[PDB]
Amino acid sequence: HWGYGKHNGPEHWHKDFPIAKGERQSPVDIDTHTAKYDPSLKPLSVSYDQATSLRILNNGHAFNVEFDDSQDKAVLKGGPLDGTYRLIQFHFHWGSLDGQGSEHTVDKKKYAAELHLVHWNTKYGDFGKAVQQPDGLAVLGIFLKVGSAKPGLQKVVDVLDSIKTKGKSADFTNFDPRGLLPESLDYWTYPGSLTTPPLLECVTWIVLKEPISVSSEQVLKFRKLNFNGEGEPEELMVDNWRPAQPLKNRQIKASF
Ligand SMILES: NS(=O)(=O)c1ccc2[nH]c(-c3cscn3)nc2c1
Numbered sequence: 001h002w003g004y005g006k007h008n009g010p011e012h013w014h015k016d017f018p019i020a021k022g023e024r025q026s027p028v029d030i031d032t033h034t035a036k037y038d039p040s041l042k043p044l045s046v047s048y049d050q051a052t053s054l055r056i057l058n059n060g061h062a063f064n065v066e067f068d069d070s071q072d073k074a075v076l077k078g079g080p081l082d083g084t085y086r087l088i089q090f091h092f093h094w095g096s097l098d099g100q101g102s103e104h105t106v107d108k109k110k111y112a113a114e115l116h117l118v119h120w121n122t123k124y125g126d127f128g129k130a131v132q133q134p135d136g137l138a139v140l141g142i143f144l145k146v147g148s149a150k151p152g153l154q155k156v157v158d159v160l161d162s163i164k165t166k167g168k169s170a171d172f173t174n175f176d177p178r179g180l181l182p183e184s185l186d187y188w189t190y191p192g193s194l195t196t197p198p199l200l201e202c203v204t205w206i207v208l209k210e211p212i213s214v215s216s217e218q219v220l221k222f223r224k225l226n227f228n229g230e231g232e233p234e235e236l237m238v239d240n241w242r243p244a245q246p247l248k249n250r251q252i253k254a255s256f
């Protein structure tokens with residue numbers, strides 16, 4: 001099945017998922033001198049005070065921190081979004097080396113990793129119905145660079161030991177995702193897709209300009225994770241990023 005290796009990676013996805021070559025695929029390179037400031041964008045509103053995490057899961061591709069999305073508690077609104085989008089999970093994409101790892105790029109610059117906070121449009125009742133709609137999802141993307149540690153990431157780092165291999169999960173309650181956010185909410189936005197199969201074109205992407213810094217020790221622990229399941233030969237979980245895809249005359253708008 002699909003993965004990131006030579007034989008099953010991004011270049012192969014289109015065979016099972018023909019939408020891989022579609023008209024609004026993600027990620028993309030953000031050309032900062034082509035993106036235009038958009039005065040019609042409302043302020044972005046990230047309201048994570050009441051977020052309720054449940055558990056963390058190694059899904060053989062990345063790890064997902066999952067949230068209880070049964071009530072309106074952690075929501076994204078404003079900016080390019082109409083209505084309210086509810087936080088369902090976050091996950092990362094990272095590299096084998098600090099020089100690569102992010103999915104979106106900025107003037108072709110690759111960051112060490114990228115955080116994706118995934119939200120569904122509450123007008124569609126749930127996630128499953130939302131992914132059938134052109135405006136069903138909003139993903140907030142945050143770049144990671146290597147420098148100072150991010151204190152609010154350590155809780156995530158320390159639990160990875162317990163979910164080393166595919167299919168493992170651990171209780172992960174009371175995690176506050178406000179601790180993963182940079183200071184500024186300046187962002188670029190464009191219509192796009194999920195960046196893994198099934199690559200559904202259902203996402204309004206909101207990519208923050210300001211990266212967060214994480215420590216070398218923090219990213220190194222991401223790289224100790226396994227793509228394989230327990231008792232299988234070790235395949236380190238690294239380079240789980242899709243490269244930039246054709247923009248195809250979409251327009252990337254800037255909030256600043
Ligand atoms: N890399 S991404 O474009 O943020 C991405 C890709 C695949 C995803 N799958 C889900 C999901 C959340 S609940 C059931 N599925 N959320 C997903 C988000």
Ligand SMILES: [Hg+2]
Pocket residue numbers: 131132133134135136200201202203
């Ligand atoms: Hg869609």
Ligand SMILES: [Zn+2]
Pocket residue numbers: 091092093116195
């Ligand atoms: Zn992602």
